[model samples]
Target chain A: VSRYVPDMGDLIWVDFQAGHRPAVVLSPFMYNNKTGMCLCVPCTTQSKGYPFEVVLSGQERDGVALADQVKSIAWRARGATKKGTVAPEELQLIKAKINVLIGL
Target chain B: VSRYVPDMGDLIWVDFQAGHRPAVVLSPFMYNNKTGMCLCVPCTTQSKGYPFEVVLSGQERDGVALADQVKSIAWRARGATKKGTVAPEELQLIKAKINVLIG
Candidate 1:
């Protein structure tokens, strides 16, 4: 079976260690295709009001992307199902917050 | 008990999801102290020939740090014990590689 490759800004359900949860793909498709991994920030229904958290729309319940909890997962091994895509501007905001969180 | 805070380049045994393993702390002390979390890259005795992996010295066995597997852990909750420290030059090299890997 072919692996599901996700593009940047793509919202997908990822099999995280805690369990399968929704996450926003942060790496471009080219990077995902080449590395077999996708950089992501898991979204949570509950927000802690952290400076790095970016509020997301287009979901049943509002979700906040956790920039501090960045992770890279092997898409093929972990399995991911695309749900939807975030607005390009919001995606860029999330990336900017990640840069700040990591002190880039 | 006070939380064990780690400084950047500090080598420590971290309780990872896989198991307890040695990792090099990448975030500075201030970050760790303020956030109660430490950014780190796990070190492995086996080398995979990946460009992102950095070889380390001053250990019983040589370990390679995996830049691609960067993670943030709450040190107090996760529990960490200091092992040693990496060379300043090697730590800088590792950080540079991480910048590339995430790009």
Candidate 2:
């Protein structure tokens, strides 16, 4: 019964990043028992714990879509954390999808 | 207003990490035209774009609770990135408050 319902100023931190490179780490995916992909931090061999942020854009989606808020992050693979103990100096990213997250 | 309403698997990613340490980098503060503090990624040099995640934890807070979830991150100071440029080899954390994020 868990879902993504964000509001303005909302937080969204990732646990894994490709050394702080958006082109490599910190993606927008949704993962859980339901989805295999994820938008959260991906546990990997370079990370130890969560290391991403989830701040509410506060901007509506296309065509004033009530704040482009949906629950979906499967954007192929922008790179994030994976399952494993990240190195103390290494870094990584995961891959997920993106969707409009709206509250009911 | 975008509020914090996480789920059991709701994710929480940090941008910086004190060069790769949990005690540092990453925070939990709500920011915007409202709160100045932030729990999300702190933008800096060396880095670009939104490189943080917001996954679900699928766990609850303290003892016997329902997914002990809340929306907050105003802890002392954990270190994050600030409005500046970070060295490709440099990393940092942020200082924010913490509030149990619930759905």
* CAPRI docking class of candidate 1: acceptable
Q: Can you give the lDDT of residue B59 in candidate 2? A: 35
- Across residues B7-37, which tens digit of lDDT does each residue of candidate 1 receive? 8889998776545689988877887788888
Judging by DockQ against the true structure, name the best candidate. 1
Instruction: Compute the TM-score of each model's chain A versus the native chain A and list the values.
Output: 0.87, 0.18
lDDT of 1 at B86: 95
> What's model 2's TM-score?
0.18
* Model 1 lDDT at residue A44: 83
Provide per-model DockQ scores.
Answer: 0.36, 0.02
TM agreement with the true structure for every prediction? 0.82, 0.18
Q: How many clashes in each candidate?
A: 0, 102
Runs off by more than 4 Å, candidate 1: A59-61, B17-19, B59-61
Off by over 4 Å in 2: A1-30, A34-104, B1-18, B21-37, B41-72, B79-103
